[PDB]
Amino acid sequence: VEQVVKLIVGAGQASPSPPVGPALGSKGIKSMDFCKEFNARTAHINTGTPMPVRVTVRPDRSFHFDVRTPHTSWLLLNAAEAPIGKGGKRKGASNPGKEVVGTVSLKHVYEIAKIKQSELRLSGLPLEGLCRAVIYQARSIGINVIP
Amino acid sequence: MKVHSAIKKRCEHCKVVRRKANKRQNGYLYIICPANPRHKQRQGYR
């Protein structure tokens, strides 16, 4: 079978490291080949930005990965001006039912949906329903919406 | 095998059967399970 791995890495931080090394170094594929290859794919993103990746490993250890847009949760928190938690990363609400970390306007959501539509696999869905799916997550992270 | 008076199915693969019933005895109700052999049960003594 052709296994698939999920890993979150920085923009230009591609090298043997917990997020990278043990994620695929144990399977057998060439790790360093992926690091020097990920830099070419990500050469216009701010240093340190999270970058989800879906690497596919075909039989005979021939790996190929398709870069994916940043996580929506990271965009909402980064767009809601939430307080940076431990480790230098913004955190959501521990109890979304009660706590509130930030408030994002509807216009801000419209821009968050366009950046996410750049993906081909997600470019077919209408933008009318795509803005409601991100508003559906704000309730799970403790972010209210103001018109 | 656990001999009980109230045999019950413990999963989806358990089956109720009446074996050892012949012209000389009435037999017992069994709970046979190919998945887990710990689900084997019987109802009655010899």
């Binding site: 081909l120 696999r121 470019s123 077919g124 869905l125 209408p126 | -």
Partner: protein, 245 residues
């Protein structure tokens, strides 16, 4: 208090349970055969979720490049490649053809107050409709002559139906070239302009789809016939040419 004889106004006596999705879904196709003049029949062969989204993605992208100069409503989203239930959908054609609401007689109906009110049961899920299709389907050779009999052999196995709100040949060319391209009549999109078409997932999904047939204004149409329809630029222009003569 509501009496026993009282029946809800929006729930007349049905031929079978209405809560189930069987009869609830039958009501959907019944109105689809009347609301959609142009309908294409396809056959999906174990298409995966990611493949389905990729197939419907090219449609939304392709159907968005069609012009609307005549000012008609924005018919660019109501076109969906919906998978139907072949079994229940087979009866849909029977009802629309072998049942006529005019052949029903009104009967007294008791409201919540108990007053007798005349009411007519014409819903497709009625016991009268169920009795009409059956007695009509009893004859075999006579049914083959109708439009339904001409489409019964196509409603075998999994079948997907494409619904177009109106008969717009312009939209057909954008859909017939993405689902069942047949060059040079309907060439597929180029690679330098629509790279999403030639993808790992999309390319593996289009090969599983096959245009088995199409239905237009309640008339059977063959595969080669759909090319003649889509081949026409627009319907209004076709009528103007006949006026020059």
């Amino acid at each position: 208090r509501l009496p026993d004889d009282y029946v809800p106004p929006t729930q007349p006596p049905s031929a079978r349970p209405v809560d189930t999705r069987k009869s609830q879904l039958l009501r959907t196709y019944t109105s689809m055969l009347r609301s959609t003049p142009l309908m294409l029949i396809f056959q999906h062969n174990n298409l995966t979720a990611i493949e389905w989204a990729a197939i419907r993605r090219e449609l939304s992208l392709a159907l968005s490049n069609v012009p609307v100069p005549e000012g008609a409503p924005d018919i660019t989203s109501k076109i969906h490649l919906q998978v139907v239930r072949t079994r229940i959908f087979d009866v849909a054609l029977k009802t629309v053809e072998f049942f006529d609401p005019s052949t029903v007689e009104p009967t007294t109906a008791t409201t919540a107050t108990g007053t007798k009110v005349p009411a007519t049961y014409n819903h497709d899920l009625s016991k009268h409709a169920w009795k009409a299709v059956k007695e009509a389907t009893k004859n075999t050779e006579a049914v083959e002559k109708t439009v339904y009999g001409q489409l019964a052999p196509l409603l075998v196995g999994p079948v997907a139906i494409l619904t177009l709100p109106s008969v717009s040949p312009a939209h057909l060319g954008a859909a017939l070239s993405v689902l069942a391209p047949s060059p040079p009549a309907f060439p597929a999109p180029s690679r330098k302009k629509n790279p999403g078409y030639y993808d790992l997932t999309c390319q593996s999904g289009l090969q599983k789809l096959l245009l088995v047939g199409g239905r237009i204004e309640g008339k059977a149409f063959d595969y080669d016939g759909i090319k003649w329809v889509g081949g026409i630029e627009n319907g209004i222009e076709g009528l103007r040419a006949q006026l020059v003569h």
